[PDB]
Amino acid sequence: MNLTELKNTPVSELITLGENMGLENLARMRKQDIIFAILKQHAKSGEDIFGDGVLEILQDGFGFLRSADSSYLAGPDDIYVSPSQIRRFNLRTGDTISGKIRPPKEGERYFALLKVNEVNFDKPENARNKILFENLTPLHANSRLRMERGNGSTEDLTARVLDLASPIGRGQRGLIVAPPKAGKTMLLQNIAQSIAYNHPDCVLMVLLIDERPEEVTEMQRLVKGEVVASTFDEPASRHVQVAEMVIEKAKRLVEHKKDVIILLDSITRLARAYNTVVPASGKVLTGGVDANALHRPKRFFGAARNVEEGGSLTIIATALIDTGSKMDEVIYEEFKGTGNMELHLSRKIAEKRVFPAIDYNRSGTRKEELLTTQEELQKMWILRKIIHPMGEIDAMEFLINKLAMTKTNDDFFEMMK
Amino acid sequence: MNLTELKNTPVSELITLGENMGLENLARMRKQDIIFAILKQHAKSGEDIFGDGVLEILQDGFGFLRSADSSYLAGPDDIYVSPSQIRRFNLRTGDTISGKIRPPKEGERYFALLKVNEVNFDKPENARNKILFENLTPLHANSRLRMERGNGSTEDLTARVLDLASPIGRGQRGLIVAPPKAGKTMLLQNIAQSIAYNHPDCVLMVLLIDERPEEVTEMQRLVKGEVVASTFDEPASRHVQVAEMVIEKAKRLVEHKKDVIILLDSITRLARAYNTVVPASGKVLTGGVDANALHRPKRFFGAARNVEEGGSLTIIATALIDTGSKMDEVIYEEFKGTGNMELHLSRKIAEKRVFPAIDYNRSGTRKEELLTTQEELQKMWILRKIIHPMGEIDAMEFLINKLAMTKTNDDFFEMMK
Amino acid sequence: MNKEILAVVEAVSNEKALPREKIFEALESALATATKKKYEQEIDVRVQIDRKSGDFDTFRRWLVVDEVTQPTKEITLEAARYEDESLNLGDYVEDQIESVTFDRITTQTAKQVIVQKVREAERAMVVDQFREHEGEIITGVVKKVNRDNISLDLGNNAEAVILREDMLPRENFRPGDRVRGVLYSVRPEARGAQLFVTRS
Amino acid sequence: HYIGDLVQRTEVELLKTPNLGKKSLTEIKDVLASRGLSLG
Amino acid sequence: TPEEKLLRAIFGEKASDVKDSSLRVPNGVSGTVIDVQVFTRDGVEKDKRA
RNA sequence: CCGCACCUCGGAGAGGUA
């Protein structure tokens, strides 16, 4: 009787089960109260109760096992983790803990954890003895993540243009610079779909912080993966906590030799949240940015790196420019000198309804020879030297007319010769 | 029993030693705690422990011996230096202290210094009587540091072009002005390799500040020397502290008649860090720079000079221009009128994959007759008069075609006449 | 982090009353006095805090001396032997740090110390203004008659003292009498400097 | 083990050994401030 | 001085001339507390024990 | 705690005990 399985069932089936068990009227009771009552009734018979969740250690020492479907929102009905077990098993924030639980006794408000059975969806013996992420030797992007579908679909044109302009690999740290109303949503959805289709082994993560609830419920019902979000109706502390939980889970997965790909579309929103929640230091920089406000997002961005011992962490954030606020401009100018990949989008091309409106001239990738072969690099260099003299709109039209003739870029490369 | 020897050992051997000694489980423990427990168990027998590190005197009076492997960062295993020991030997920040140490006893948290054995890689008797760096008579560069190796490798072309454009000597103070994506990393690596090969007596120090971790791990595993780095994940205060530690160590080494060379590609980043960590004074100049923000980097830059009594302090830094931020432009315009050597690089030539893309016309060296002979100066003047009429790309192509004819510059100069 | 004292040292300061260092010195002296008055047979306890986020720690110190006088605050040279006897006589700072004891009632004497140091800073400002407008013979009223020293009064929160050696050997002063004297130097007396006046 | 053996020797003699720590010396000083033990 | 009360109102730190007037137990008498009652005037906010 | 935004410690009455 897992907690997640009981939380995923609809309210109707829960009310039906509660009426069959013979409890009080559950129609006017909350779903969480129904779950609590049915867990008490099931434990009264003598059966054991099991649960799971990601650990969220508080400042006082203890922590809880939050759920992913609620963006790790603080709730009164979760698995309490005593500091004793934390000191015993050396648990940290982000460790996925699964084990036996029990209903709280009189005077308690949370489910107590007795014994942990599975750590990070793996054996506890392999999770206790491990090399920390701070000790992993970083490296440049070595493996290639080919975003091209190859099925000849019209949606694959965006992935083809992306692979021709900025090849992305495992451990890449890129930036998607674009003005508002450029098409970042559809482009990010296409990137997520291509990652889920071509690279299913990669752990795709979408973190939409401080966005509209309609866009959140659209993203959750469109892509095949995990979508942890935090709308603007929640305070900035919620955003900070969600980002911390996500980066801790990503670090734990990378330590467990997993290829995590994080698509962030709120780096500017996260920086604003950090600048809002930071105490008044007394020194304000140009644009209303605090001195210690850019530390946390810059570290979150730099966390992405390629691991030689195993696994990789790829983070492709999306920047916001020309938003009318000088603070966002200062944030973009500061974060520009940090990454090594910029995917610019042109508003002039977007106004002509030419999607995708990708600035091919200003795009590029540093050390691209480590992700492409010699002949592929030579062909890309020749294509750039031929395209550069033409204008942005003309270059995009030429590229679309050339890619529309065939399905794969290999045929275009063979015909160019 | 040395601190650095036990610190350089891998985790496996330390865990094995701890398990053989019969202590608590060392698998779920940090390396520092393992070393601490091993040192405690070894001192309980009665043997002496030794350590080393550069001294960092705090404002309260006490000091700490920071380690080199941690890039001079505050760690739990730092060696506590009481103010009494500083008053006995008249110690200062930067003085390397290699001597007998003891583990922290009951109530203590840092290793204590019992007896100092070596000061600045020399006897304390020779260090107690020394001439300060401020007393050394400054002079122009006299000893020539020929970057050209003479072996004939294709990497030596950059050093040859640098020697033919702007010769560098002991204590030279120059700036490598280059826009982003100009090829500063490869040029700095080539300079470091040439210095290591031709002049192995010159202490090479590659100080990285606010750089990428991939570039850091690439630099560390490529050059043969000491590499002190501080990625952007650290705040500006840590950057300033690391820069101060490095410059104090360099000054204390130069005071012992040593040839120290610092390759810091962070002059603009260091200026930004100083402007960020400086308290607000209410007077902001053009570019968002405080009136006293540039004083510290100006003095750091001007500290480089040639010493006639012995030793030299060479600082070759790379600058950034056309970065889209007017602050960097103001910083470059202020730092241009301070030094006596400017190495400008062209982005137009760099886009054509023509290396080295060095602005030969704008380059030059003040008082270059003290590092080159009369005939060499005449040949350089003739080369300048021949190159000046041609365009930048044309001059680069001419120089490449001329250097491809021979292996060394001497044969080229002999055949030109 | 102790946000309570942080907000105070950040807000109340910067108004020429707290120079960001004398305020911290007064606060640590007040905490030391509170800890001294807390214990019964344990005197001479000090505390040093010179950081915003960094909290304060109470490290009770002993007086390094080769004698046994004041056995409650005296230590021997064998404790300094760990530092190879570098701790010369006359300087007393070394010991293990102990448990700190903070309380809201300790602010009573802390506020008194703070306002006393503010009055001392205002006295220093009056001294500076007097130096800015010095160069004339002044008159003052004596308050007390101590051994080899007297006092002067100019009611602008100012005060002055005259050394007895500089005065006439026959003339003895009494409170309420006006005294003519030109000041020439201010020696840094303990707990605030005082304007020294001389007649000879 | 007993306090009498430690009180038989002066605090200077106890401080002349590396077996004693900073916390132990502070506790001994706090115990001796009450004039109950460690009085030479 | 009316400036010190402004500082007392700026921070939550207590500062006043505190005199002890607590209810103590008379000499000789003893016992075990079996009941405690608290009566508060209208308008005044109640405390934790009340 | 004064203003957010980068060009060259008492009196009366009632009851009781010896």
Coordinates of C-alpha atoms in Angstrom, one line a residue, chain B:
Chain B
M1 CA 54.6 12.0 8.6
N2 CA 53.7 15.0 6.4
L3 CA 50.4 16.6 5.8
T4 CA 50.7 16.9 2.1
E5 CA 51.9 13.3 1.7
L6 CA 48.8 12.0 3.5
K7 CA 46.6 14.4 1.6
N8 CA 47.9 13.3 -1.8
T9 CA 47.2 9.6 -1.1
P10 CA 44.0 8.3 -2.6
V11 CA 40.9 7.5 -0.5
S12 CA 41.3 3.7 -1.0
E13 CA 44.7 3.5 0.8
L14 CA 43.5 5.8 3.6
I15 CA 40.4 3.6 4.1
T16 CA 42.5 0.5 4.1
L17 CA 45.0 2.0 6.7
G18 CA 42.1 3.0 8.9
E19 CA 40.5 -0.4 8.7
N20 CA 43.8 -2.0 9.6
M21 CA 44.2 0.4 12.6
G22 CA 40.7 -0.7 13.8
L23 CA 38.7 2.6 13.8
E24 CA 35.1 3.6 12.9
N25 CA 33.9 2.8 9.4
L26 CA 35.8 5.1 7.0
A27 CA 33.8 4.4 3.9
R28 CA 31.0 6.8 4.8
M29 CA 33.5 9.5 5.9
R30 CA 35.4 12.4 4.3
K31 CA 39.1 12.2 3.5
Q32 CA 39.9 15.0 5.9
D33 CA 38.3 13.2 8.8
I34 CA 40.2 10.0 7.9
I35 CA 43.5 11.9 7.9
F36 CA 42.5 13.6 11.1
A37 CA 41.8 10.3 12.9
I38 CA 45.0 8.7 11.5
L39 CA 47.1 11.7 12.7
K40 CA 45.4 11.5 16.1
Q41 CA 46.1 7.7 16.4
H42 CA 49.7 8.2 15.2
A43 CA 50.3 11.1 17.7
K44 CA 48.9 9.0 20.5
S45 CA 51.9 6.7 20.0
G46 CA 54.4 9.5 20.4
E47 CA 55.7 10.3 16.9
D48 CA 56.1 13.8 15.5
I49 CA 53.9 15.2 12.7
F50 CA 55.0 17.7 10.1
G51 CA 53.1 20.1 7.8
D52 CA 53.4 23.0 5.4
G53 CA 51.5 25.8 3.7
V54 CA 51.4 29.5 3.0
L55 CA 50.5 31.6 6.0
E56 CA 47.3 33.7 6.0
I57 CA 47.2 36.1 9.0
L58 CA 43.7 37.1 9.8
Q59 CA 42.7 40.6 11.1
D60 CA 42.3 39.3 14.7
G61 CA 46.0 38.4 14.9
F62 CA 46.1 34.6 14.3
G63 CA 47.1 33.0 11.1
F64 CA 46.4 29.9 9.1
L65 CA 48.6 27.7 6.8
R66 CA 46.4 27.2 3.8
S67 CA 47.1 24.2 1.5
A68 CA 48.1 24.4 -2.1
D69 CA 45.8 21.6 -3.4
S70 CA 42.7 23.5 -2.1
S71 CA 43.8 26.6 -4.0
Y72 CA 44.3 28.4 -0.7
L73 CA 40.8 28.0 0.6
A74 CA 39.6 28.0 4.2
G75 CA 39.4 24.3 5.2
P76 CA 38.7 22.5 8.4
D77 CA 42.3 21.0 8.4
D78 CA 44.0 24.4 8.4
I79 CA 47.0 24.8 10.7
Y80 CA 46.3 27.3 13.5
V81 CA 49.1 29.9 13.9
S82 CA 49.0 31.7 17.3
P83 CA 49.9 35.4 17.3
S84 CA 52.8 34.7 19.7
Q85 CA 54.6 32.6 17.0
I86 CA 54.0 35.5 14.5
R87 CA 55.5 38.0 17.1
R88 CA 58.6 35.7 17.7
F89 CA 59.6 35.3 14.0
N90 CA 58.0 38.5 12.7
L91 CA 55.9 36.5 10.2
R92 CA 53.7 38.0 7.5
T93 CA 51.0 36.9 5.1
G94 CA 52.6 34.9 2.3
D95 CA 55.5 33.3 4.3
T96 CA 55.4 29.6 3.7
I97 CA 55.8 27.8 7.0
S98 CA 57.1 24.2 6.9
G99 CA 57.6 22.8 10.3
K100 CA 56.5 20.4 13.0
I101 CA 52.8 20.4 13.8
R102 CA 50.6 18.7 16.3
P103 CA 46.9 17.5 16.1
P104 CA 44.3 19.7 17.8
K105 CA 43.8 18.6 21.4
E106 CA 40.7 18.6 23.5
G107 CA 38.6 21.7 22.7
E108 CA 40.7 22.7 19.6
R109 CA 39.6 22.6 16.0
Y110 CA 42.8 23.4 14.1
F111 CA 46.3 22.0 14.0
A112 CA 48.9 23.9 16.1
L113 CA 52.4 24.8 15.1
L114 CA 55.0 23.6 17.6
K115 CA 58.3 24.4 15.8
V116 CA 58.9 25.9 12.4
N117 CA 61.6 24.1 10.3
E118 CA 61.5 25.9 6.9
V119 CA 60.5 29.4 5.9
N120 CA 59.8 30.2 2.3
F121 CA 61.6 27.0 1.2
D122 CA 64.7 28.2 3.1
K123 CA 66.1 28.3 6.6
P124 CA 64.4 30.6 9.1
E125 CA 67.8 32.2 9.9
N126 CA 68.1 33.4 6.3
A127 CA 64.4 34.6 6.4
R128 CA 64.7 36.6 9.6
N129 CA 67.2 38.9 7.9
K130 CA 65.8 39.9 4.5
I131 CA 65.2 43.0 2.4
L132 CA 61.6 43.9 1.8
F133 CA 60.0 44.1 -1.6
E134 CA 59.3 47.8 -1.1
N135 CA 63.0 48.4 -0.6
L136 CA 64.1 46.7 -3.8
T137 CA 65.2 49.2 -6.4
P138 CA 62.9 48.9 -9.5
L139 CA 64.4 48.7 -12.9
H140 CA 63.5 47.8 -16.5
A141 CA 63.7 44.3 -17.8
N142 CA 67.3 43.3 -18.3
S143 CA 67.4 39.5 -18.5
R144 CA 65.8 38.2 -21.7
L145 CA 63.2 35.4 -21.4
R146 CA 63.3 34.1 -24.9
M147 CA 60.0 32.4 -25.5
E148 CA 61.2 30.7 -28.7
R149 CA 62.2 27.1 -27.8
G150 CA 64.1 26.4 -31.0
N151 CA 63.0 22.8 -31.3
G152 CA 60.8 23.5 -34.4
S153 CA 57.3 22.5 -33.3
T154 CA 54.2 24.0 -34.8
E155 CA 53.3 25.2 -31.3
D156 CA 56.5 27.3 -31.1
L157 CA 55.1 29.6 -33.8
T158 CA 53.1 31.6 -31.3
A159 CA 56.2 32.1 -29.1
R160 CA 58.2 33.1 -32.2
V161 CA 55.6 35.7 -33.2
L162 CA 55.5 37.0 -29.6
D163 CA 59.3 37.3 -29.5
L164 CA 59.4 39.1 -32.9
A165 CA 56.5 41.4 -31.8
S166 CA 57.0 42.1 -28.1
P167 CA 59.9 40.4 -26.2
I168 CA 59.3 39.5 -22.6
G169 CA 62.0 39.5 -19.9
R170 CA 62.3 38.9 -16.2
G171 CA 59.8 41.2 -14.4
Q172 CA 58.0 42.3 -17.5
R173 CA 54.5 43.9 -17.1
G174 CA 52.3 43.4 -20.1
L175 CA 48.7 43.0 -21.1
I176 CA 47.2 40.8 -23.8
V177 CA 44.2 42.7 -25.1
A178 CA 41.8 40.3 -26.9
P179 CA 38.1 40.2 -27.5
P180 CA 36.1 37.1 -26.4
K181 CA 36.7 33.9 -28.5
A182 CA 40.1 35.1 -29.7
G183 CA 42.2 32.2 -28.6
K184 CA 43.6 33.3 -25.2
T185 CA 43.6 29.9 -23.6
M186 CA 45.8 28.3 -26.2
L187 CA 48.2 31.3 -26.3
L188 CA 48.5 31.2 -22.5
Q189 CA 49.2 27.5 -22.5
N190 CA 51.8 28.0 -25.2
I191 CA 53.4 30.8 -23.1
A192 CA 53.5 28.6 -20.0
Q193 CA 54.9 25.6 -21.9
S194 CA 57.6 27.8 -23.5
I195 CA 58.5 29.3 -20.1
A196 CA 58.7 25.9 -18.5
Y197 CA 60.9 24.4 -21.3
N198 CA 63.3 27.3 -21.9
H199 CA 63.5 28.7 -18.3
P200 CA 62.8 25.9 -15.8
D201 CA 64.3 28.0 -13.0
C202 CA 61.4 30.5 -13.2
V203 CA 58.6 29.6 -10.9
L204 CA 55.5 29.2 -13.0
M205 CA 52.1 30.0 -11.3
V206 CA 48.9 29.7 -13.3
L207 CA 46.3 31.6 -11.3
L208 CA 42.7 31.2 -12.5
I209 CA 39.9 33.3 -11.1
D210 CA 36.2 33.1 -12.1
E211 CA 36.9 30.5 -14.8
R212 CA 35.0 27.4 -16.0
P213 CA 35.7 24.1 -14.2
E214 CA 36.3 22.3 -17.5
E215 CA 39.0 24.8 -18.4
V216 CA 40.4 24.5 -14.9
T217 CA 40.7 20.7 -15.1
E218 CA 42.1 21.0 -18.6
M219 CA 44.8 23.5 -17.4
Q220 CA 45.7 21.5 -14.3
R221 CA 46.3 18.2 -16.3
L222 CA 48.2 19.9 -19.1
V223 CA 50.9 22.2 -17.6
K224 CA 53.7 21.0 -15.4
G225 CA 53.5 23.3 -12.4
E226 CA 51.4 24.8 -9.7
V227 CA 47.8 25.7 -10.7
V228 CA 45.7 27.8 -8.3
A229 CA 42.1 28.1 -9.6
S230 CA 38.8 29.6 -8.3
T231 CA 35.8 28.8 -10.5
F232 CA 32.8 31.2 -10.8
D233 CA 30.9 29.0 -8.2
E234 CA 32.9 30.9 -5.5
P235 CA 31.9 34.5 -4.5
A236 CA 34.0 37.5 -5.4
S237 CA 35.3 37.6 -1.9
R238 CA 37.0 34.2 -2.3
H239 CA 38.4 35.4 -5.6
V240 CA 39.9 38.5 -3.9
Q241 CA 41.3 36.3 -1.1
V242 CA 42.9 33.9 -3.5
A243 CA 44.4 36.7 -5.5
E244 CA 45.8 38.3 -2.3
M245 CA 47.3 35.0 -1.2
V246 CA 48.9 34.4 -4.6
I247 CA 50.4 37.9 -4.8
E248 CA 51.7 37.7 -1.2
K249 CA 53.3 34.3 -1.9
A250 CA 54.8 35.7 -5.1
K251 CA 56.2 38.8 -3.3
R252 CA 57.7 36.7 -0.5
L253 CA 59.3 34.4 -3.0
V254 CA 60.7 37.4 -5.0
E255 CA 62.1 38.7 -1.7
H256 CA 64.2 35.4 -1.6
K257 CA 65.6 36.2 -5.1
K258 CA 63.2 34.0 -7.0
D259 CA 61.8 34.5 -10.5
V260 CA 58.1 34.2 -10.1
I261 CA 55.7 34.4 -13.1
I262 CA 52.0 34.8 -12.7
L263 CA 49.7 34.1 -15.6
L264 CA 46.3 35.6 -14.4
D265 CA 43.7 35.9 -17.1
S266 CA 41.3 37.6 -14.7
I267 CA 42.4 41.3 -14.6
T268 CA 38.9 42.4 -15.7
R269 CA 37.2 39.7 -13.6
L270 CA 39.4 40.7 -10.6
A271 CA 38.4 44.4 -11.1
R272 CA 34.7 43.3 -11.2
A273 CA 35.2 41.3 -8.0
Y274 CA 36.9 44.3 -6.3
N275 CA 34.1 46.6 -7.4
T276 CA 31.5 44.1 -6.1
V277 CA 33.1 43.6 -2.7
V278 CA 33.9 47.2 -2.1
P279 CA 31.4 49.0 0.3
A280 CA 29.2 51.6 -1.3
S281 CA 30.7 55.1 -1.1
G282 CA 28.0 57.1 -2.9
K283 CA 30.3 58.1 -5.8
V284 CA 30.0 55.9 -9.0
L285 CA 32.1 56.7 -12.0
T286 CA 31.2 56.0 -15.7
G287 CA 30.7 52.3 -16.2
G288 CA 29.4 51.4 -12.8
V289 CA 32.9 51.4 -11.2
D290 CA 33.6 52.9 -7.8
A291 CA 36.2 55.7 -7.4
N292 CA 38.4 53.3 -5.2
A293 CA 37.4 50.1 -6.9
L294 CA 40.3 50.3 -9.5
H295 CA 43.0 51.2 -6.9
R296 CA 43.5 47.6 -5.7
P297 CA 43.8 46.1 -9.3
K298 CA 46.0 49.0 -10.4
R299 CA 48.4 48.4 -7.6
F300 CA 48.3 44.6 -8.2
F301 CA 49.1 45.2 -11.9
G302 CA 51.9 47.7 -11.1
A303 CA 53.4 45.4 -8.5
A304 CA 55.2 43.6 -11.4
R305 CA 58.7 44.9 -11.8
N306 CA 62.3 43.7 -12.3
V307 CA 64.6 43.6 -9.3
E308 CA 68.3 44.2 -9.7
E309 CA 69.3 42.8 -6.3
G310 CA 67.8 39.5 -7.2
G311 CA 64.6 37.8 -8.5
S312 CA 61.8 39.3 -10.6
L313 CA 58.0 39.5 -10.7
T314 CA 56.6 38.9 -14.1
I315 CA 52.8 39.3 -14.7
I316 CA 51.4 38.5 -18.1
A317 CA 47.6 39.1 -18.0
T318 CA 45.0 38.9 -20.8
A319 CA 42.4 41.7 -21.1
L320 CA 38.9 41.6 -22.6
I321 CA 37.4 44.2 -24.9
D322 CA 34.2 44.5 -27.1
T323 CA 32.4 42.3 -24.6
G324 CA 29.2 44.3 -25.0
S325 CA 29.6 45.9 -21.5
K326 CA 30.8 49.5 -21.3
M327 CA 32.3 48.7 -17.8
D328 CA 34.9 46.4 -19.4
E329 CA 35.6 49.2 -22.0
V330 CA 36.2 51.7 -19.2
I331 CA 38.4 49.2 -17.3
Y332 CA 40.5 48.6 -20.4
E333 CA 40.8 52.3 -21.1
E334 CA 42.0 52.9 -17.6
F335 CA 44.4 50.0 -17.5
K336 CA 45.9 50.9 -20.9
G337 CA 47.6 54.1 -19.7
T338 CA 49.2 52.2 -16.8
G339 CA 51.3 49.4 -18.3
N340 CA 54.1 49.5 -20.8
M341 CA 53.2 46.5 -23.1
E342 CA 50.0 45.9 -25.1
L343 CA 49.3 42.7 -27.1
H344 CA 46.2 43.3 -29.1
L345 CA 44.4 40.5 -30.9
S346 CA 42.0 40.9 -33.8
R347 CA 38.7 39.1 -33.9
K348 CA 38.4 39.4 -37.7
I349 CA 41.6 37.4 -38.2
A350 CA 40.6 34.9 -35.5
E351 CA 37.3 34.2 -37.3
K352 CA 39.4 33.1 -40.3
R353 CA 41.2 30.5 -38.2
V354 CA 44.5 32.3 -38.7
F355 CA 46.7 31.9 -35.5
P356 CA 48.3 33.7 -34.0
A357 CA 45.9 36.6 -34.8
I358 CA 48.2 39.2 -33.3
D359 CA 48.0 42.9 -34.1
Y360 CA 51.6 43.4 -35.1
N361 CA 51.3 47.1 -35.8
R362 CA 49.7 48.1 -32.5
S363 CA 52.1 45.8 -30.5
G364 CA 55.4 47.0 -29.1
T365 CA 57.6 47.1 -26.0
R366 CA 58.9 50.1 -24.1
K367 CA 62.7 50.2 -23.8
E368 CA 63.0 47.1 -25.9
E369 CA 66.7 47.8 -26.6
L370 CA 67.5 46.4 -23.1
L371 CA 66.2 42.9 -24.1
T372 CA 67.3 42.8 -27.8
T373 CA 70.5 43.6 -29.6
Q374 CA 71.1 46.4 -32.1
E375 CA 70.9 44.2 -35.1
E376 CA 67.8 42.4 -33.8
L377 CA 66.2 45.8 -33.2
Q378 CA 67.1 46.9 -36.7
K379 CA 65.6 43.6 -38.2
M380 CA 62.4 44.1 -36.2
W381 CA 62.2 47.7 -37.5
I382 CA 62.6 46.5 -41.0
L383 CA 60.0 43.8 -40.5
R384 CA 57.6 46.4 -39.1
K385 CA 58.2 48.8 -42.1
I386 CA 57.6 45.9 -44.5
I387 CA 54.5 44.7 -42.7
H388 CA 52.8 48.0 -41.9
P389 CA 51.6 48.8 -45.5
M390 CA 49.9 45.5 -45.9
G391 CA 46.6 44.7 -44.3
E392 CA 46.0 42.8 -41.1
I393 CA 45.0 39.5 -42.8
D394 CA 47.6 40.1 -45.5
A395 CA 50.3 40.7 -42.9
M396 CA 49.3 37.5 -41.1
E397 CA 49.4 35.5 -44.4
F398 CA 52.8 37.0 -45.2
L399 CA 54.2 36.2 -41.8
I400 CA 52.9 32.6 -42.0
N401 CA 54.3 32.1 -45.5
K402 CA 57.6 33.5 -44.4
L403 CA 57.9 31.4 -41.2
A404 CA 56.9 28.3 -43.1
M405 CA 60.1 28.5 -45.2
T406 CA 62.5 27.9 -42.2
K407 CA 62.5 26.5 -38.7
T408 CA 64.1 29.3 -36.7
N409 CA 63.8 33.1 -36.9
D410 CA 67.5 33.5 -37.2
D411 CA 67.6 31.8 -40.6
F412 CA 64.6 33.9 -41.7
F413 CA 66.3 37.1 -40.7
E414 CA 69.5 36.0 -42.4
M415 CA 67.7 35.1 -45.7
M416 CA 65.6 38.4 -45.7
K417 CA 68.8 40.4 -46.0

